[PDB]
Amino acid sequence: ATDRGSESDKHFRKVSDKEKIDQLQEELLHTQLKYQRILERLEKENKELRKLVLQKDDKGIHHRKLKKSLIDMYSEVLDVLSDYDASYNTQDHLPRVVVVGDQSAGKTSVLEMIAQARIFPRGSGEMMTRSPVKVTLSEGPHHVALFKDSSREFDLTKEEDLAALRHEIELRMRKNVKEGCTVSPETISLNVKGPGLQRMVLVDLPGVINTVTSGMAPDTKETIFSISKAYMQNPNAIILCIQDGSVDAERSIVTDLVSQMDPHGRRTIFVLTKVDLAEKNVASPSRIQQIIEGKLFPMKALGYFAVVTGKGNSSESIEAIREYEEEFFQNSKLLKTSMLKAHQVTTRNLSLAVSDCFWKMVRESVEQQADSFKATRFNLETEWKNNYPRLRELDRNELFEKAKNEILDEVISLSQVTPKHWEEILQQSLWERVSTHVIENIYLPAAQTMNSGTFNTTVDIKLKQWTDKQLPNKAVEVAWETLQEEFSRFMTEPKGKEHDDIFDKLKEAVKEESIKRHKWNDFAEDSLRVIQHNALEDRSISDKQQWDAAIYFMEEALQARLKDTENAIENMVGPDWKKRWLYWKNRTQEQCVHNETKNELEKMLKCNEEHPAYLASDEITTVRKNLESRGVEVDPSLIKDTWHQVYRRHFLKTALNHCNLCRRGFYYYQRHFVDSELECNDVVLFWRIQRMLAITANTLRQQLTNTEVRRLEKNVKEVLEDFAEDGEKKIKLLTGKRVQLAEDLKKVREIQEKLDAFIEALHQEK
């Protein structure tokens, strides 16, 4: 009878097994223990069956050391790195090839005529590049590129598919840009296969703008510079410097961006675009001869200075661009009358030369990263472990689940609270809430008559009306709060000096959802009304012990009121001579008035001890004249306020003296046959309420332990499952700086594997 919710769950839980254990045992334990093992061993078979078919498309199985997915290893390493750390602290050490040049140059053309002319939005009229776009190029058949690493199935040779693919990239480009600028560092990941593509990662960084026009947000050019740090602070970056062939080199921006990155040109190759505009204006090949020699290019870029040319139409196909480029370069005086042989100028030579320089840098510098990340992990683990010796290995998934079980365990522990605590806490809390209402609004005005029948009649009518409207509504609220008060203590209270504060955000977050769903039984009040009516209706106290308990607790309530009034009075009247002379204090003129106003009222009560609480205006006038006769002029309102506090002090002392004789007078045996005027009807009123609330608490406790705590437990389970799926809150709640460090350690460990996997793939040559 102490608790019934736990028994119900066990009974039906066994029933479920008795009917379905022959299916549950296989699914719940046998399958799950083998499930993890088969992931390593049997999924291996299905992965290999498809992988081999995919490798045949790659040709990796057919040809040793030659596989189109071999270059995809390089991108996988960077994809983890960008997710692990997209900031300069990690990005600055990641090898890459970047397209750098004046925005007007159309610098991206170096990549458009390879694969991107079909799927990347282009054309003049507006700035196209909005954020770094990385394209993973690989020798292979035509295949729809990955867009934001998302799979696609499109034909790259038909306009209808390509147009939709151009839309997809544009959406990422603009969405990466936030208010205040037109460019964003947030990168876009593309991976395309097709003929003529080289194994390398080329990034089209947003074009630099000398000045921010009114058509662009003010921070455009500063943002591009910060994005330009992808190479300016990256010793592993290869820079393709694009000179806008429409304008002279002395008008360029790229010269300063790269010359401050590598003034020796060791990390860069200079490329020129739109050279054919030289013949749409008065061509000056003598300036081109300086261009090839790098006289006017401070970065002294190394390699052959390739040139890109195009019809300028934004619909020219990749094949059309290649054919146009070859014919123009092989005949134009810009290159035929200067030392720029077309077979070195052609973009396809740049793609090969860029691919050649790409693998040179990657193999040389990649091994340094493996040592760097390993050193990082050891330094992080040493400090992380020393500050958190308890957690040698931690994850945010492990952190959440521990709380999930811990929370459910505590709420169950809350369900283990004995009724003794519930009944005492509910009874004590509820009575204290309504202890003054009865005294001030029911008892004291009823005490103004000497007719005990009216006294009991008056209160009973008020109580029944009060009972119907207030008592069960306050009682449930106390019970609802009382359960939450213990729940919070069970939930988030520390175990002395040991406490995992890392879990407090989730615990309180779970509570708020669980209390919102904690709807107390809407009919609990109806039972209490019947109970309270019966508890009040039965006023028969035939037991001395019932009398003894009721009177002592009534005294405490009255003594509390007496001190409450007395403390208010002392402030109203101030210190007496004992404290005025002891602490060198004095009275305010109001306190002086109150003391004399008190004295006159005390004298009035000294004789008229039975004076009713209500004062006649003649008494108010009499006091005023009695005080005015001593030089004290008092507003009637002061007297009435003084009167109320002093009267209760007078009354309450009388009531306690009545209580003293009620217990003592009846206690003496020979006095029980003396019918004195000591009808302790207040003890009858107090006793019934004490019993009435005690029964109320028991009804609340029964509902508390039978229905409400189970609803609280059920809601917690519903909320915790929502949190289990709510990754963002789990991240937002689990921010303890050790799980985040543990998360970083995991990512560092993964990168070390990914770094070595690619490095291991480099070592396939020997």
Task: Kindly state the tokens that stand for 544.
Answer: 């001395």
With b for 16 or more beta-carbon neighbours within 10 A and e for fewer, the 478-489 pattern comes to bbbebbbebbee
- For a copy of itself, the closer CB: 190 or 551: 551
Q: CB-wise, 131 or 427, nearer to ligand ALF?
A: 131
338 residue type, one letter: S
- Contact between 428 and a copy of itself per CB under 8 A: yes
Q: Is 274 marked as binding a ligand? A: yes
731 contact choice in ligand GDP, K ion, Mg ion, none (CB below 5 to 8 Å, kind-dependent): none
Binding mask 246-285 for ligand GDP (x = CB under 6 A): ---------------------------xx-x---------
> Is 312 assigned to a binding site?
yes
Q: Which of residues 57-96 bind a copy of itself (CB under 8 A)?
A: none
Q: List the single partner that 560 binds among a copy of itself, ligand ALF, K ion, none, CB under 5 to 8 Å by kind.
A: a copy of itself
Please name the helix (run of DSSP H) or strand (run of DSSP E) that holds residue 555, with its range, or none. helix 544-573
Segment near ligand GDP (CB under 6 A); pick from 194-202, 305-313, 602-610, 615-623: 305-313
Distance CA 100, CA 81 (A): 23
Q: Residue 315's CB: how many other CB atoms inside 10 A?
A: 10
**Sole binder of a copy of itself in the list 92, 525, 564, 718 (CB under 8 A):** 564
Q: What angle do CA 289, 294, 298 make, to 5 degrees?
A: 145
The correct pick among 9, 393, 401, 493 for binding a copy of itself (CB under 8 A) is 493
Distance of closest approach, residue 746 Cβ to ligand GDP, in angstroms: 37
Judge residue 471's burial from the number of C-beta atoms within 10 Å of its C-beta, 0-12 exposed, 13-18 middle, 19 or more buried. Answer: buried
Q: What's the closest the beta carbon of residue 460 comes to a copy of itself, in angstroms? A: 14
- In the complex, what is the shortest distance from the CB of residue 302 to ligand ALF, in angstroms, rounded to a whole number? 20
For residues 262 and 98, give the distance between their C-alpha atoms in angstroms, rounded to a whole number. Answer: 14
How far apart CA 545 and CA 552 sit, in angstroms, is: 11
Per partner kind, with CB cut-offs from 5 to 8 A, the member of a copy of itself, ligand ALF, ligand GDP, none near residue 195 is none
Cα–Cα distance, 391 to 200 (Å, whole number): 41
The residue from 78, 105, 249, 693 that contacts K ion (CB under 5 A) is 105
Q: Is 313 assigned to a binding site?
A: yes
Segment (H or E) for 231? helix 220-232
299, 261 Cβ separation under 8 angstroms: yes
The piece of 125-133, 141-149, 554-562, 572-580 that touches ligand ALF (CB under 6 A) is 125-133
Q: Helix 471-492 vs helix 709-725: angle between axes, to the nearest 10 degrees?
A: 50
**CA 280 from chain center: how many Å?**
60
Question: Binding residue for ligand ALF (CB under 6 A) from 60, 106, 185, 472?
Answer: 106
Query: How is residue 3 annotated by DSSP?
Result: -
Give the position of tokens 């605590």. Answer: 421
| 395 membership: H or E segment, kind and range | none
Smaller CB separation from a copy of itself, 329 or 490: 490
Selected from 61, 73, 80, 127, the binder of ligand ALF by CB under 6 A is 127
Partner whose footprint covers residue 206, from a copy of itself, ligand GDP, ligand ALF, none (CB < 5 to 8 Å by kind):
ligand ALF
In this chain, which stretch among 256-264, 426-434, 723-731, 751-759 interacts with a copy of itself, using CB under 8 A? 426-434
CB 553 within 8 A of CB 690: yes
Q: Which two tokens stand for residue 563?
A: 């001190």
Determine which residue in the list 123, 141, 195, 453 makes contact with ligand GDP, applying CB under 6 A: 123
The whole-angstrom separation of Cα 100 and Cα 108 is 9
Q: How many CB atoms lie within 10 A of CB 87?
A: 9
435 labeled part of a ligand binding site:
no
Q: Per CB under 5 A, which of residues 97..126 are in contact with Mg ion? A: 107-108
Residue 106 annotated in ligand binding: yes
Which CB, 294 or 312, lies closer to ligand GDP? 312
129 is a site residue for ligand ALF (CB under 6 A): yes
Does residue 441 touch a copy of itself according to CB under 8 A?
yes
What span, in angstroms and rounded, lies between the C-alpha atoms of 578 and 575?
7
Let me know if 126 is exposed, middle or buried by CB neighbors in 10 A (0-12, 13-18, 19+).
exposed
Interaction between residue 492 and a copy of itself (CB under 8 A)? yes
Shortest distance, CB of residue 567 to a copy of itself, whole angstroms? 7
Q: Where are the beta strands (DSSP E) in 274-366?
A: 306-308
For residues 143 and 153, what is the distance between their CA atoms, to the nearest angstrom? 8
Helix axes 739-762, 68-84, angle to 10 degrees: 160
Residue 81 has a CB neighbour count (10 Å cut-off) of: 21
Provide, rounded to whole angstroms, the least separation between the CB of residue 101 and ligand ALF: 6
Please tell me the distance from the alpha carbon of residue 284 to that of residue 282, in angstroms, as a whole number: 7
- The single residue among 76, 84, 121, 587 that binds ligand GDP, judged by CB under 6 A, is 121
Using the rule CB under 5 A, give the single segment among 47-55, 66-74, 99-107, 432-440 that binds K ion: 99-107
Strand-pair category, 188-194 with 133-139: parallel
**CA-to-CA distance for 271 and 245, rounded, in angstroms?**
10
* Interaction of residue 433 with a copy of itself, rule CB under 8 A: yes
Residue 556 makes contact with a copy of itself by CB under 8 A: yes
Interacting span for ligand ALF (CB under 6 A) from 126-134, 330-338, 502-510, 528-536: 126-134
Residue 221, marked binder: no
308 forms part of the interface with ligand ALF (CB under 6 A): no
* Residue 309 annotated as binding site: yes
The amino acid at residue 13 is: R
Give the binding range for ligand ALF (CB under 6 A) out of 105-113, 338-346, 419-427, 693-701. Answer: 105-113
Shortest gap between Cβ of 537 and a copy of itself (angstroms)? Answer: 21
Least separation, in Å, of the C-beta of 496 and a copy of itself? 3
Q: Which stretch binds K ion (CB under 5 A): 80-88, 100-108, 245-253, 306-314?
A: 100-108
**By CB under 8 A, residue 661 contacts a copy of itself:** no
Sign of the C-alpha dihedral computed for residues 208, 211, 215 and 217 taken in this order? positive
The token pair at 59 is 């040709």
Query: Residue by residue, what is the 3-state secondary structure of 261-321?
Result: CCCCCCCEEEEEECHHHHCCCCCCHHHHHHHHHCCCCCCCCCCCCEEECCCCCCCCCHHHH
For a copy of itself, which stretch binds (CB under 8 A), given 390-398, 429-437, 683-691, 735-743?
Answer: 429-437
Number of residues that bind ligand ALF (CB under 6 A): 12
Q: Alpha-carbon distance 317 to 323, whole Å?
A: 10
CA dist 206 and 195 (Å) reads 26
Determine contact, residues 614/588, Cβ cutoff 8 Å: no
> Considering the rule CB under 6 A, would residue 308 count as an interface residue with ligand GDP?
yes
Q: Any known ligand binding at 104?
A: yes
User: Annotated binding residue at 540?
Assistant: no
* Contact (CB, 8 A) for 157 and 107: no
For the CB of residue 638, give the shortest distance to a copy of itself in the complex, in Å.
10
Write the residues followed by a gap in the chain (C–N more than 2.5 A): none
**Is residue 641 involved in binding a copy of itself (CB under 8 A)?**
yes
Dist. CA 185–CA 201, nearest whole Å: 17
Q: Is residue 129 a contact residue for Mg ion (CB under 5 A)?
A: yes
Question: What are the structure tokens assigned to 13, written together?
Answer: 């839980």
Extract the annotated binding site for Mg(2+).
108, 129, 204
Q: Which residues bind ligand GDP (CB under 6 A)?
A: 103, 105-109, 112, 121-124, 127-129, 273-274, 276, 307-314, 316
Q: Where on the chain is the footprint of ligand ALF (CB under 6 A)?
A: 101-104, 106-108, 127-129, 206-207
List interacting residues with K ion (CB under 5 A): 103, 105
Residues in the annotated binding site for GTP? 104, 106-109, 123, 274, 276, 309, 312-313
Which residues bind to a copy of itself, rule: CB under 8 A?
418, 420-421, 428-429, 432-433, 436-437, 440-441, 445, 448-449, 465, 481, 485, 488-489, 492-497, 512, 556, 560, 563-564, 567-568, 611-614, 616, 637, 641
